[PDB]
């Protein structure tokens, strides 16, 4: 935060909010200022025409050529070089949009390049007359690939985005059986288990999402079932990888192939080009405006009594407000040329190649890009109205969303905002007006989207069952977590929730304690002190002598830096 | 320029100049505003405590460990990984200072890591029972190293600094004979000749400076004389590498080892630590304030007549002004903690490891860091005063500089400002007051530092001879160029100027036409049109179908983007 690149970003942030204050209609800013809604990234958009997140079309760029910076890159002739260009792209893309960036199916996209490192090695055992032909190659290739993903793993943690930060990047895999594809998968997983750096700590990025599917990943007999096992190990030691149910995913998205989340959890919906092809990679999201659901209910109290009709009034009113807010920023996009971000619009990233002087707004119309109507705190809302209305209000929302899509041509969808930050702001702005409302603003924060309350006491299986239906309503983005104790040696139980989840819902992640004592090397849950974590079996307390990760909200982090 | 990262940098720039307007004493800003002096980087410093340029202590970082971003890196066990960490460091450092960044003697620093790629390969020909032991290794290692520097070459052109730009980076080599050291040298050189990207164009960065020295690089019998030959080829095809006379360099700097330039041409002077060791790597420069020499003379005209005494008055007056300006920004550095730029002050970069809460100002005191008093236009000055006073005014300047050093403890030195940009601004600000003064402001720009006028008509040998003495007066930074026609096949003549130069001066570069037609593949000087370059032997004119580089001022660039 005192670091230079950050100071600089901050400057551009202050200037941006200032310009926003002037571009955004007074009534929308007012609502944002007071917590009715929340216009995300007001420190980037609409001051400059940034977009949000995306699925980089890596196959397109690496396949054909592309210019990156000053280099007109050619197709990689080796695996290591591809995961380099990828780490470089990760950085450039992170610097031309204010949202997460995702490389979907690296196992399948990067496969060709393993097949080249192999070719190269076979032609080498054959040049130097080596005993084992097919055996040299295997080995060398297995290594080249581990190193290649160890490079990526590190480069994502050493390369900075223009705002002076590590790229928020997501890598997905799992639907590949070819030997090269399987090789990348174990490559990614072994590296993560290994840990980042000298002390093999749990990296916070890149996120790892593995698709699990019947006949590939989840049954004792399926081909990559061994991979599932390494995956369970990995997750029990570093949280990631999260898993996505290929079955429910396809069903919910409408795509014939599993849809990877752009960033944390923004899902695209199936879309086709002029020639009728389902396009996934290269597509993106235009932004997010989150609706403070609790605040709708609170604002519609008469005295200390909830008034149902008042709710129906403000709801419809705030629904329109949100549409006006989203449409505001989308319009700011008119006139903007491709000159604004070459790797996105001119070279491969967004899946097309626009001329410099082309408008960028057309590339997003008619459903290619998605737009987010975010919500939060279904729990506190229920408490305020007196009954679970979650499944249904979210549904009254898709209804509006559908009308919007039809009137504007933009593909709007229900997004369950991660709100690592918003969970506090809204509560705080609401507390400012309503004081400490029991069970609502009292705890200090709101529960994520449709998640069960933490303070509730259910069974992992019961929790996923209570949430699963939402994975089908809030299609724009969604995820479910369940808390388990150390599972390092109980992978069967861990695999039991994964299995149950992969059946009933879509995007799933299980977060359990992942700690490491540097002095004593204890992979056991440190016990919390009124002053941090303490090593049970070595008494270690100095924070610098340990790595303590916990996914308290959306990302992982050391909970000893917050209070 | 419409590109996002740049828009953002711009915002932070406007905010920074604004804050400077408030921090910098009115009289200094006034002088800057009017062209008497020129406070460089007012868009970074003093708004934030940035520093200028430096020699990264890569040996220190790679040797011991170091944290970069989130990764606690360990010593490279392979050559490719070292030139990766280097490309990553290049980026991080470029993002914590507003000046060039240099990696001195990559041949010697990176040597160990070639010796490891070799070890690894020998142990492999020995594991797979390969025919040629020492021969497999050689080959594999020779390749690993070419690839390693081809990665660096590219990564410097694809990685961005926080301001949305390719790092201004300099790589030096040449004083190494070990086989590994020689290997890096040819590695660097072959890659450059190869060209950047699909169309093998002349990269603009990283700059290449090779030290040439008797008994190593420049005589038919010396060991790396073959390298000199590849070097001459390289330079004739891509401008770089520039050369530095190890003999005169040591002499001028006082260092026992050739001193590499921080950035374009900022030379350090020999300095020692508490234990009496000459330290080079890790040292840096605090900044630059350039004095408009011509403007001193013009301002000291009485009517249309130059008045000598008036000159002596303003000169002494402006000399003090410059000192007050430099001291201004240096003071802004008091209080600043190491938390401001970890890779520089906490991890290896600046050669020491400060605690977070340590002040950074102490690290620069008592001569470790240099400070720049820049000057420009010795030619126009001569014309205004009526006689060459260059060698001597620069000398009256070192005198002041020496007093400053003694009063402040900071190591001030005469810097011959590159002024790729300033060469026009000063002239323009002066023209604003004196109209079009014959031979001075009339041409539109001022001649760099002590360089002979372009419009003059001398012999390469005569030009270097007229400049050489300045390489010994303006010790803070200096360089000489000479213009030659295509030399692609005349390396002996090219080597003749290099040889003559390496004898009489210090930092040398020869710029000749380096063009390439993409449609016809003609490495011949395109002939200039009132509308760009035209291919002689293929008539090609479309700019996109060619790469036309020319070092018109300090950097190389396509002269078809300016007018
Ligand atoms: N491509 C990379 N970019 C940045 N840091 C890297 C990269 N690859 C590895 N590192 C980090 C991790 C460790 O601190 C150290 C490892 O170097 P190195 O041992 O060469 O890696 P490696 O695992 O590919 O090789 P090996 O298996 O030979 O040890 O550098
Ligand atoms: N480390 C790197 N980072 C970014 N781009 C790179 C890197 N290495 C090479 N490139 C670019 C240059 C070309 O457009 C293309 C070359 O890929 P590749 O052919 O694998 O390089 P190479 O020269 O190391 O291998 P080879 O000798 O096998 O061709 O990618
Ligand atoms: Fe411990
Ligand atoms: Fe041509
Ligand atoms: Mg190649
Ligand atoms: Mg290693």
Coordinates of C-alpha atoms in Angstrom, one line a residue, chain A residues 2-5 7-13 15-16 19 43-44 47-51 68-74 81 84 87-88 91-92 95-97 120 124 127-133 135-137 139-140 143 147 150 154-164 166 196-199 201 336 339-342 344-345 356 544, chain B residues 2-5 7-13 15-16 19 43-44 47-51 68-74 81 84 87-88 91-92 95-97 120 124 127-133 135-137 139-140 143 147 150 154-164 166 196-199 201 336 339-342 344-345 356 544:
Chain A
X2 CA 3.0 2.4 0.5
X3 CA 4.5 0.7 -2.5
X4 CA 5.0 3.0 -5.5
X5 CA 2.9 1.2 -8.2
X7 CA 0.5 4.9 -4.9
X8 CA 0.3 5.6 -8.6
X9 CA -2.8 3.5 -9.1
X10 CA -4.4 5.3 -6.2
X11 CA -3.8 8.6 -7.9
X12 CA -5.5 7.4 -11.0
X13 CA -8.2 6.1 -8.8
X15 CA -9.0 11.0 -10.5
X16 CA -11.3 8.3 -11.8
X19 CA -14.6 12.0 -13.3
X43 CA -12.3 3.8 -9.8
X44 CA -11.8 2.5 -13.4
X47 CA -13.7 7.3 -16.4
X48 CA -12.0 5.0 -19.0
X49 CA -13.9 2.3 -21.1
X50 CA -12.6 -0.7 -19.2
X51 CA -14.5 -3.9 -19.1
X68 CA 2.3 -8.7 -27.5
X69 CA 4.1 -5.5 -26.6
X70 CA 6.6 -5.1 -29.4
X71 CA 7.0 -8.8 -30.2
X72 CA 5.1 -10.4 -33.0
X73 CA 5.0 -13.8 -31.4
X74 CA 4.9 -17.0 -33.3
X81 CA 7.6 -21.1 -24.1
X84 CA 5.7 -18.2 -20.7
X87 CA 2.2 -15.7 -18.0
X88 CA 3.0 -12.7 -20.2
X91 CA -0.1 -9.8 -17.1
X92 CA -1.1 -7.8 -20.2
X95 CA -3.6 -4.6 -17.2
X96 CA -6.4 -3.7 -19.7
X97 CA -9.5 -4.6 -17.6
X120 CA 11.8 -32.7 -30.0
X124 CA 17.0 -36.2 -29.8
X127 CA 20.1 -38.0 -32.9
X128 CA 22.4 -39.0 -30.0
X129 CA 21.7 -42.7 -30.4
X130 CA 20.2 -43.2 -26.9
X131 CA 19.3 -46.5 -25.4
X132 CA 15.7 -45.9 -24.5
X133 CA 14.0 -44.0 -27.2
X135 CA 11.7 -43.8 -22.5
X136 CA 14.1 -40.8 -22.7
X137 CA 11.4 -38.7 -24.4
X139 CA 11.0 -38.6 -18.9
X140 CA 12.5 -35.4 -20.5
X143 CA 10.1 -32.8 -16.7
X147 CA 9.1 -27.0 -15.0
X150 CA 6.3 -24.2 -12.2
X154 CA 5.8 -18.4 -10.1
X155 CA 5.5 -15.8 -12.9
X156 CA 1.9 -15.2 -11.9
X157 CA 3.2 -14.4 -8.5
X158 CA 6.1 -12.2 -9.6
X159 CA 4.6 -10.4 -12.5
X160 CA 2.7 -7.3 -11.8
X161 CA -0.4 -5.8 -13.3
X162 CA -0.1 -2.0 -14.1
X163 CA -1.8 -1.3 -10.7
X164 CA 1.1 -2.9 -9.0
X166 CA -0.3 -9.8 -8.9
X196 CA 5.3 -21.4 -3.5
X197 CA 8.9 -20.5 -2.9
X198 CA 11.6 -21.5 -0.4
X199 CA 9.0 -22.2 2.2
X201 CA 3.6 -21.6 1.0
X336 CA -14.4 3.8 -27.9
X339 CA -6.8 1.4 -30.1
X340 CA -7.7 1.4 -26.4
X341 CA -6.3 -2.1 -25.6
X342 CA -4.6 -4.0 -28.4
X344 CA -7.8 -7.5 -26.1
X345 CA -9.3 -6.2 -29.3
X356 CA -7.7 -0.2 -34.7
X544 CA 6.9 -14.5 10.0
Chain B
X2 CA -4.9 5.7 -25.9
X3 CA -3.9 2.4 -24.4
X4 CA -5.3 2.0 -20.9
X5 CA -2.1 1.6 -18.7
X7 CA -4.1 6.7 -19.7
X8 CA -3.8 5.6 -16.1
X9 CA -0.1 6.6 -15.8
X10 CA -1.1 10.0 -17.3
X11 CA -3.7 10.5 -14.6
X12 CA -1.0 9.9 -11.9
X13 CA 1.2 12.3 -13.9
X15 CA -1.7 14.6 -10.2
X16 CA 2.0 14.5 -9.6
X19 CA 1.6 18.2 -6.2
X43 CA 5.7 13.7 -13.1
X44 CA 7.1 11.3 -10.6
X47 CA 5.2 13.9 -5.5
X48 CA 6.5 10.4 -4.5
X49 CA 10.1 9.6 -3.4
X50 CA 11.2 7.9 -6.6
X51 CA 14.8 7.7 -7.5
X68 CA 9.8 -10.9 -5.5
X69 CA 6.1 -10.3 -5.4
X70 CA 4.8 -13.2 -3.4
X71 CA 7.6 -15.7 -4.3
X72 CA 10.6 -16.2 -2.0
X73 CA 12.9 -17.1 -4.8
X74 CA 15.8 -19.5 -4.4
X81 CA 15.3 -19.8 -14.9
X84 CA 13.5 -15.4 -16.2
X87 CA 13.2 -10.5 -16.9
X88 CA 10.9 -10.4 -13.9
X91 CA 10.0 -5.4 -14.8
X92 CA 9.7 -4.8 -11.0
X95 CA 8.2 -0.1 -11.8
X96 CA 9.8 1.5 -8.7
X97 CA 11.9 4.2 -10.2
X120 CA 22.7 -31.3 -15.2
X124 CA 22.1 -36.9 -17.9
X127 CA 22.2 -41.4 -16.6
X128 CA 21.0 -42.5 -20.0
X129 CA 24.3 -44.0 -21.1
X130 CA 24.9 -41.6 -24.0
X131 CA 27.6 -42.0 -26.5
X132 CA 29.2 -38.6 -26.4
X133 CA 29.4 -37.4 -22.8
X135 CA 29.6 -33.6 -26.4
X136 CA 26.0 -34.1 -25.5
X137 CA 26.4 -31.7 -22.6
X139 CA 25.3 -29.1 -27.3
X140 CA 22.4 -29.2 -24.9
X143 CA 21.0 -24.5 -26.7
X147 CA 16.9 -20.1 -25.6
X150 CA 16.0 -15.4 -26.3
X154 CA 11.4 -11.3 -25.7
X155 CA 10.2 -10.9 -22.2
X156 CA 11.7 -7.5 -22.0
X157 CA 9.6 -6.6 -25.0
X158 CA 6.4 -8.2 -23.7
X159 CA 6.6 -7.4 -20.0
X160 CA 5.3 -4.0 -19.0
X161 CA 6.3 -1.5 -16.4
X162 CA 3.5 -0.2 -14.3
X163 CA 3.2 2.8 -16.6
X164 CA 2.3 0.5 -19.4
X166 CA 8.4 -1.9 -22.0
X196 CA 12.6 -9.7 -32.7
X197 CA 9.6 -11.7 -33.7
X198 CA 8.2 -13.3 -36.8
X199 CA 9.8 -10.6 -38.9
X201 CA 12.9 -6.6 -36.5
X336 CA 10.7 7.9 3.4
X339 CA 8.3 0.0 2.7
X340 CA 8.1 2.2 -0.4
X341 CA 9.8 -0.3 -2.7
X342 CA 10.7 -3.7 -1.4
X344 CA 14.8 -2.1 -4.2
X345 CA 15.5 -1.6 -0.5
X356 CA 11.0 -2.0 6.4
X544 CA 3.6 -1.9 -42.2

